[PDB]
A = this chain, B = another copy of it.
Amino acid sequence: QLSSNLWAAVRARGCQFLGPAMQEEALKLVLLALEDGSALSRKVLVLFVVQRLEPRFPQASKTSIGHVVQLLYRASCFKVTKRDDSSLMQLKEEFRTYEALRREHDSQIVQIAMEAGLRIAPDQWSSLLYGDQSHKSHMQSIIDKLQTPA
């Protein structure tokens, strides 16, 4: 019930979580393209990612990867250069490591759960987002930052 309701809330907001392994690889590919400050259109960023993902993850599509990009967009990860032509995205300087990018990504899904009234604990979050229990403290610190400080 809980997971189903979380992923519905994510999809309701134009976003997607592709499962722990696929999301991790999708994010590492976004990072590979943008960590040096390259400025890519959605077209080109998605082309870059889908092409490399599709062999291992056949569910990779322009639509599903676009939705992962939208999650990062909603999280304010990008500097956007607007045009008369397709707008460009760069990763903001503070988010050009996997740890940082993953922190904003994960925080955005927690905020979505808060927006939808879902009460999820660190252990549950670790399973949901990583398929393991090695990110409990990572998830606890995300939640603390979204609540009144001590």
Contact = CB atoms under 8 A, between A and B. Distances in A.
Most buried by B among A37, A41, A43, A83: A37
Nearest to A86: B36
A55 to B, nearest CB: 9
Given A48-B47, A51-B52, A38 B36 contact: no
Interface in A14-33: 32-33
Contacts of A41: 36-38
Interface residues of A, number: 18
A88 B37 CA distance: 8
A65 interface: no
A47 B52 CA distance: 10
Contacts of A43: 36, 38
State the majority secondary structure of interface residues on A. Answer: mixed
A99 to B, nearest CB: 19
Interface string A79-100: 0000101101000000000000
A36 B33 CA distance: 16
A118 interface: no
Most buried by B among A32, A44, A52, A86: A44
Nearest to A45: B38
Interface string A48-60: 1001100000000
A65 to B, nearest CB: 14
Contact of A48 (B39, B44, B85): B44
